[PDB]
Amino acid sequence: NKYKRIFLVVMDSVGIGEAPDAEQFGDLGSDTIGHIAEHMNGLQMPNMVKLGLGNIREMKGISKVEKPLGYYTKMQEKSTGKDTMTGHWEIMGLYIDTPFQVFPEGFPKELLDELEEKTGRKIIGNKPASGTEILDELGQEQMETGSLIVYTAADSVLQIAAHEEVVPLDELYKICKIARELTLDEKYMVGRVIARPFVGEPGNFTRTPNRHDYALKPFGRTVMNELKDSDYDVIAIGKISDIYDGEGVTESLRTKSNMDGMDKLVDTLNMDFTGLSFLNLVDFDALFGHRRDPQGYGEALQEYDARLPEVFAKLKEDDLLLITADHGNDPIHPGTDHTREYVPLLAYSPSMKEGGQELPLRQTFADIGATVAENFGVKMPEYGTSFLNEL
């Protein structure tokens, strides 16, 4: 192999400007990093800059350099949707025609009617909400009626909450599996169904660790499947294992924040493995993008950038670092949904002794998967063009 270990970092939702098909999505004018840079009166990301971020696009406080550490370009999304699952599935070599849906005004009556009809239970709520808000509002009614609290969020999720002393946990999991089957339907395609059992009394409800997620498997065998099947290490950090429903994952490392995600990246740099270490930094999307909080988003990006020099110091000659994103989520955009954007691509190895150059624009995110596959000599994915030879 040209590289013994590839470290792939997805900065979740960190877009680099509206994509060519942004109009279809109502995303004209969107620009995640650019709007954040403007809000911050200049972003301080000196390490991403040294890698060549500004060489991709100059933005406030983000300038090009004469000799970037590695290679740089951006990527265009080919799949129909702009959600996290679509983006990650494309990265690992797939093409996804059918988008996952988001539900800002709740779920269609048709879907909820069929769920009631199958479960023998009434449904209440049906709106985007955090776990705490919805329980305060509807927990007592749930307890008294044996109802199900069905709710959503800014991402493609259907969440079902029930008190553990009113609806048995095993019954809640059965209900969620029914909902998982019903939501495999393009009219109401949700990324994930989530059991949200809770306990306590009115004015003091607590969600329990008995939460269970019901994810869909990627629509195809990914490069991660192929890596795993050829006995390579595939170390998933953060939401990565969940995003792929465990497909192709050999070890999974849970994280609780972006700084924790960088600590686990460092842990994998200290492991003797051959194959892929794959980090998702999710705070960008989950805490700041959807909440339309450009200040918190800007601070998070600066906090992330300050961690990078330790990553640089630990990379070996036969290590490759890849930094990218899976869509945009512009924190100064209308509504609460993602935005259809190009995503940056930075490719760095210490063996690049004369620095890098511009790569041709990646026409699908799957060029990442093709590059990984070619590096490790596994079956090339159906989609994507490797840039391994350009490095």
Residue 77: contacted member of Mn ion, ligand 1X4, none (CB under 5 to 8 Å, by partner type): none
User: How many residues belong to the site for ligand 1X4 (CB under 6 A)?
Assistant: 5
Whichever of 155 and 233 has its CB closer to ligand 1X4, that residue is 155
Whichever of 55 and 79 has its CB closer to Mn ion, that residue is 79
The residue number with the shortest CB distance to Mn ion is 84
Minimum separation from the CB atom of position 357 to ligand 1X4 (A): 39
Residue 285: contacted member of ligand 1X4, Mn ion, none (CB under 5 to 8 Å, by partner type): Mn ion
Cα separation, 333 vs 216, in Å, equals 29
Quickly tell me which residue has 């509504």 as its tokens: 335
**What are the structure tokens assigned to 322, written together?**
């890849």
**What are the structure tokens assigned to 38, written together?**
């403007």
Binding mask 133-172 for ligand 1X4 (x = CB under 6 A): --------------------x-x-x---------------
> Cβ–Cβ contacts within 10 Å for residue 272, how many?
7
Residue 327 assigned ligand-binding role: yes
Cβ neighbors of 309 (< 8 A, separation 6 or more) are 47
Residue 163 assigned ligand-binding role: no
Among 2, 4, 21, 26, binds Mn ion (CB under 5 A): 26
Residue 212 assigned ligand-binding role: no
* Side chain identity, residue 374: E
**Alpha helical stretches, state H, the chain:** 32-39, 46-51, 53-56, 84-91, 109-119, 131-145, 169-182, 223-229, 240-243, 258-269, 283, 294-314, 366-376
Looking at the DSSP assignment, which residues form a beta bridge with residue 157?
A: 192
Residue 326 assigned ligand-binding role: yes
Whichever of 26 and 246 has its CB closer to Mn ion, that residue is 26
Among 319, 316, 346, 341, smallest CA distance to 331 is for 341
Residue 130: contacted member of ligand 1X4, Mn ion, none (CB under 5 to 8 Å, by partner type): ligand 1X4
Whichever of 79 and 84 has its CB closer to Mn ion, that residue is 84
Among 291, 380, 324, smallest CA distance to 74 is for 324
Residue 26: contacted member of Mn ion, ligand 1X4, none (CB under 5 to 8 Å, by partner type): Mn ion
Residue 333 assigned ligand-binding role: no
- Contact between 157 and 191 (Cβ < 8 Å): yes
Residue 12 assigned ligand-binding role: yes
Contacts with ligand 1X4 by CB under 6 A lie at 130-131, 153, 155, 157
> Can you say which residues are annotated as belonging to the binding site for Mn(2+)?
12, 285, 290, 326-327, 338
